[PDB]
Design a protein around this ligand. Structure first.
Ligand SMILES: CCCCCCCCC(=O)c1c(O)cc(O)cc1CC(=O)OCCCCC
Lengths: 233, 235
């Protein structure tokens, strides 16, 4: 499809390549102090979230149909899927067999260097990464899946039908791809790990909560809004 | 002083169950099985919190001077210390060598009957309990310590100087007692006061737990607990 192709093109451009990969800050051993954290750690965690939202936003803008949705709805979909997309993209691009977190900017960091800012949450993501990797999801299948996480019903959409339309479009594109390379199943197996993912988002909210409590540095505003809008109260 | 100390001790003892009005009817140390957390666990956790609330208020009312602070400041101090006090009184009352949580009603429960509702937080409390017990804090020393958790600076007080005054009064009372029983005139005291910052950290774990449960939203919190959660979030 030209669609599939546009999805893959959007996806690949939204992450880095082996070249663009940044070992400038990477250290294979750091001796941190567990269960505590300073302002640098907290800022870097927030900055990694921020930059991921910026990248995810540009990625979404290249999904055909997405940019013509209402602004409100664009924001709503992005904000509602952000954490879920952050984790999924992180898990898919990282290298858990080496303890390597690879973020969308190309920044590579070791699990121990992420321990301070992220807490447990980073270990939990790596476990998810390993589990997502054992499914062997190829790039076009993934390029579709990720878009379907974004383009989905959310409460408060102004034009849910347009969203549902686009959702169907992308579903068909995926279905078609997984038929073409076969020559319902992997999918049921994929959906099997969604609870891991729902839990992982939850861990993210808890970690933001905790850091907000700590208040060493204030969250960026859009991250802060997402945190708050996600809360049912 | 003096008689202050005596009023503190009297308030403290009257605010908890007698060794003989203790309730083991619900105690079971063997809990088969997990996994996750059902709704009966969440309600019991909220109910246990609730039950300490009214008791801590009557306890505070018997601290000399406390009723002579502004009503607004009274509410603020209670709400801001509820969690810390709940934990401190629990940690002191309970028996961590045996896994026994003893609540202010007299209800005795095993750490595994509290795990589902409280999560990690109960282990953290028990660790604190064990550590508070190694200090061998006698009842008057404790009767003072608890009051000092309540009577302390908080943001929004109308008369912080008066709160400070009463705080100092109680501090002196404590200092004096710990000198009169340890060897005059500190280590033990600086070790006692060491527990207050730990207690804040445990309050934090409580908020995190309430957050998480509010997120899960099996059962909603009681409004007054909910209000305390919300008022004591700086946002
Ligand atoms: C785990 C609790 C989720 C239930 C919360 C209900 C609201 C969900 C929602 O639609 C919503 C929104 O309308 C705007 C937002 O900015 C955020 C959300 C929350 C949402 O997308 O679910 C969890 C992940 C949030 C960050 C990607």
């Amino acid at each position: 499809a030209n669609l599939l192709t546009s999805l893959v093109r959007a996806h690949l451009d939204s992450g880095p390549s082996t070249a663009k990969l940044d070992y400038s800050k990477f250290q294979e051993l750091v001796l941190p102090h567990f269960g505590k954290e300073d302002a640098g750690d907290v800022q870097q965690f927030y900055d990694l979230l921020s930059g991921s939202l910026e990248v995810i936003r540009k990625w979404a803008e290249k999904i055909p149909g997405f940019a013509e949705l209402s602004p409100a709805d664009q924001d709503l979909l992005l904000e509602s899927a952000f954490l879920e997309l952050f984790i999924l993209r992180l898990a898919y691009r990282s290298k858990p067999g080496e303890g390597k977190l690879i973020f969308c900017s190309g920044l590579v960091l070791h699990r121990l260097q992420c321990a301070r800012g992220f807490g447990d949450w980073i270990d939990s993501i790596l476990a998810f990464s390993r589990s997502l990797h054992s499914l062997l999801v190829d790039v076009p299948a993934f390029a579709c899946l990720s878009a379907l996480v974004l383009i989905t019903d959310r409460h408060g959409l102004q034009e849910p039908r347009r969203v549902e339309e686009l959702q169907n479009r992308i579903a068909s594109c995926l279905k078609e791809h997984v038929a073409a390379v076969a020559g319902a199943s992997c999918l049921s197996r994929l959906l099997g790990k969604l609870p891991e993912l729902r839990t992982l988002c939850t861990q993210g909210l808890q970690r933001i909560f905790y850091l907000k409590l700590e208040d060493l540095v204030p969250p960026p505003p859009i991250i802060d809004k997402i945190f708050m809008d996600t809360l049912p109260f």
